[PDB]
């Protein structure tokens, strides 16, 4: 059983997104498909469901107007069109198999919609240099999420902490630390690898002693 959701989206306020949910592994005609919203660190809000065999829908009044749910029975795909988007609709959207009395037993991977006026902005990357030694990387001033950080091209994995990004002044900042034996650095290279797909940026910062 699988529900494959469409890729994340960055749209401006007042826009509309069409989210899709391609399913397989169960009789589509016979099941309910629900759409849900979840903001970071919050609980889930059920938006709507559609019964795929009839195409009939039930909507949560808290969103009615904004959501329109349909299915294309030929391709086992459910859709949600979500309109009059505001910044407060920035969230992860889920489709799930379930609805009515039926528990939601299979879930999509989530589609991350970001609704913002802010422009795509690439990150500035700064080295954090100082027995175990802690090194670090500061990634500042970018938009939208995500940036990813690896050390030594992903081969340096133990002792790594990559912290969730925080939004200030409409730009994100995150940091990552790595702790290595002091015999191993600077004798051996430690490098921060930062990637920001939205701006097509890759940055490698070698950490060298101050």
């Amino acid at each position: 059983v699988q529900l494959q959701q469409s890729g994340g989206e960055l749209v401006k306020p007042g826009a509309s997104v069409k989210l899709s949910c391609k399913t397989s592994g169960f009789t589509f005609s016979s099941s309910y498909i629900s759409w849900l919203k979840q903001k970071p660190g919050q609980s889930l809000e059920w938006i709507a469901w559609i019964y795929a065999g009839t195409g009939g829908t039930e909507y949560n009044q808290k969103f009615t107007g904004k959501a329109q749910v349909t299915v294309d029975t030929s391709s086992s795909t459910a859709y949600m069109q979500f309109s009059s988007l505001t910044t407060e609709d920035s969230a992860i959207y889920y489709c799930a198999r379930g609805g009515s009395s039926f528990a939601m037993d299979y879930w999509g991977q989530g589609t991350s919609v970001t609704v913002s006026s802010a422009s795509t902005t690439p990150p500035s990357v700064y080295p954090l240099a100082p027995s175990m030694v802690t090194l670090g990387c500061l990634v500042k001033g970018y938009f939208p999420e995500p940036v990813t950080v690896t050390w030594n091209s992903g081969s340096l994995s133990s002792g790594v902490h990559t912290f969730p990004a925080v939004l200030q002044s409409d730009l994100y900042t995150l940091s990552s630390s790595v702790t290595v034996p002091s015999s191993t650095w600077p004798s051996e290279t430690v490098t921060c690898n930062v990637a920001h797909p939205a701006s097509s940026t890759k940055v490698d910062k070698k950490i060298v002693p101050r």
């Binding site: 609980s43 939601m104 879930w107 080295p127 954090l128 902490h161 969730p164």
Partner: protein, 216 residues
């Protein structure tokens, strides 16, 4: 709209012991001698996963350590024994009446022994200063329990504005938390002072845990 009240907001349970989460629906979710109460487990960045449906029935591939109970308006999730993989958000969810509604969710964490944070302080890099800004960074890594407060001091005087904190969730390997605290200033203010101090209060010590550097 049905309101589901979960409790507690978070709990910490030792490996091998019993976790109990409660859900109080403002209203009966019974219909047809069936209680329409569901329980979900969600790990970070993953979709929810159904644990218990119709109050007391296992989800597919859900072991019997997870068990739901209850009728009417009172429901319980029991996890016995708790295993390392069980750190997650737990939500109850009612499918008796439209709109479907979730509880606000309970965070389950693994209780381990105390661990003082390893504190590291970094002055702004010379690269950052060429842009006119200055971030002082403090990492407080691998501590338990999660509760912690960080204070910044500049030449001994506390500075509250311009401080950004971020935390990790419980590490699935050693069950600790980590925290990043960033104090940002202008280059000019940064270079007018000498002593920068990252100060943490944690159960590990009655006294603040202090790390500093002199811009010297």
């Amino acid at each position: 709209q049905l309101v589901l009240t979960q409790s507690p907001a978070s709990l910490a349970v030792s490996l091998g012991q019993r976790a109990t989460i409660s859900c109080r629906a403002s209203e009966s979710v019974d219909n047809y001698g069936i209680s329409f109460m569901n329980w979900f487990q969600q790990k970070p960045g993953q979709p929810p996963k159904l644990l218990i449906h119709t109050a007391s029935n296992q989800g597919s591939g859900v072991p019997a350590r997870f068990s739901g109970s209850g009728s009417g308006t009172d429901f319980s999730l029991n996890i016995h024994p708790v295993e390392d993989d069980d750190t997650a958000m737990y939500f109850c969810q009612q499918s008796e009446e439209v709109p479907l509604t979730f509880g606000a969710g309970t965070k389950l964490e693994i209780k381990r022994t105390d661990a003082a944070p390893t504190v590291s302080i970094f002055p702004p890099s010379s690269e950052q200063l060429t842009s006119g800004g200055a971030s002082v960074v403090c990492f407080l890594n691998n501590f338990y329990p999660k509760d912690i407060n960080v204070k910044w001091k500049i030449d001994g005087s506390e500075r509250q504005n311009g401080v950004l904190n971020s935390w990790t969730d419980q590490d699935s390997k050693d069950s600790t938390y980590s925290m990043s605290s960033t104090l940002t200033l202008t280059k000019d203010e940064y270079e007018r002072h000498n002593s920068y101090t990252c100060e943490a209060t944690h159960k590990t010590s009655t006294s603040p845990i202090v790390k500093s550097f002199n811009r010297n």
